[PDB]
Design a protein around this ligand. Sequence first.
Ligand SMILES: [Cl-]
Lengths: 140, 141, 141, 143
Amino acid sequence: SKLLPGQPAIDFEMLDVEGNVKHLADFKGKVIYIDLWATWCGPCIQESPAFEALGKKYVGKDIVFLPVSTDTTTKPWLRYLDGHKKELTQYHSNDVALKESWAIMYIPRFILIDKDFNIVNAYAPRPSSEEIGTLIDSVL
Amino acid sequence: ASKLLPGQPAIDFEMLDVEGNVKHLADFKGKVIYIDLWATWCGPCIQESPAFEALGKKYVGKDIVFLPVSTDTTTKPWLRYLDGHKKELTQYHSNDVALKESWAIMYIPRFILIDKDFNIVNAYAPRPSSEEIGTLIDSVL
Amino acid sequence: ASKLLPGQPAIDFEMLDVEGNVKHLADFKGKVIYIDLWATWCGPCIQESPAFEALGKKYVGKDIVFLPVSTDTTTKPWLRYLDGHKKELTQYHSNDVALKESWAIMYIPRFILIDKDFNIVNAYAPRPSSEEIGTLIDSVL
Amino acid sequence: ASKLLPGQPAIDFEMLDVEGNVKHLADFKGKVIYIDLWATWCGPCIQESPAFEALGKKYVGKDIVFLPVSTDTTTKPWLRYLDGHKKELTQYHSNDVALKESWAIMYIPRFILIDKDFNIVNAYAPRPSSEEIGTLIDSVLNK
Ligand SMILES: [Cl-]
């Protein structure tokens, strides 16, 4: 029951394509919608166009969209990005805190965190879903 | 609205059992409630039905109820489908305007998870076939 | 039926555009045809709409047509839904009895891919949003 | 590619069972073949596991085989996964490059259906949980 709405989020690390290290708590104070995906996962990639459109649509608002590849190694991820260009800042993560503190066994996975850095939904709806817009608006 | 956020109170609505008797969502206050809103022509809905039944089996004796609620426009195709496909769980049907107007049920499949307190856990809950619904349900008990 | 296997001839049906003019599937013979059968209150159908529109745009000028066919019981919600949601591809609607009785379309969403000769490629085709549909379509072109 | 169109010959690949015995897809020529290519961390993949198993039961004794093929990069999580979740069909694992290369399979879940001549029916078959897969299989078993 650590992951239920209202419970605090759990930090993890992520690398960007250049090498900078960011941690989830850097975005403390914004609404955070996280997309976990991987290059060989069809249903994950099917959601990318909608996650990107959300990014564009809320550019002017206090929410951060984190796309985090969980590919085992970095190279299929970078190889994938070279062929499939993206507008949001891309992250990559094989942080053990994802598996052991977030208990993430499967992807796709979507998470919505509110401004106080509390979980709103540990199991958030997909970015292509009709309701995510209102869910997101509600949270702002 | 902000009224469907986690921690907000569930909204009651009326449904009908296969015998044409009224029931209310409120009758279940005190249990964890997982609702499956579905319809006979909806492939994905009908795809989850095996998993929703198996959840009912798997959690027999825990304080949760599984409500399969048809949103078919008329009861006729619902009862026809049920004659040709038997189910362990008690089946319900609803056309209550409150589904569209208080729960913003514009589309199906729609899954909803409500807590023993009759508060929303997730108004857009994961699907019955997912690993995630198990873990989430385990967490609310 | 064995009538829907790849390489078997497609089955014609009637549909209406927004202005009530009639067309038939067979009018498009000679092109690759990708059909999206959907309805206004089908969540997963409408979630594919952006991708289906993106394919139509991506393949403009190539020898393929994209047919968005609403199977809504009546015309009205279809038309209202379109007023709110402007789509680029020409929209159709159909209650032709053949959909159910020849194509065995019992459930939506449903996607169908037909080749230039008007034979079935895949009567249960991948979804518009999938990576798999583009490679499929290119295969066929 | 054009080589994965219905009616084209299927493409062999090597796979291993939980004991390390080797089998090749082409060994099954003569039977309809429905392949489920999945991995332990792909949620949508294992969402289909029950239905795939239900189908192997529904069609026991008929001229079709059901092949669940883990594409996990390593065998350990696969083996660990089956440990804790029991399964009636014989389980297989593959990392044959023929998958990516010749079958041009870049994403899972992925399902393939092959006819008794070892020709492709659908390289992109419906999911096991779907209502149509059973109509499709039956349609292939009659022909
Ligand atoms: Cl949640």
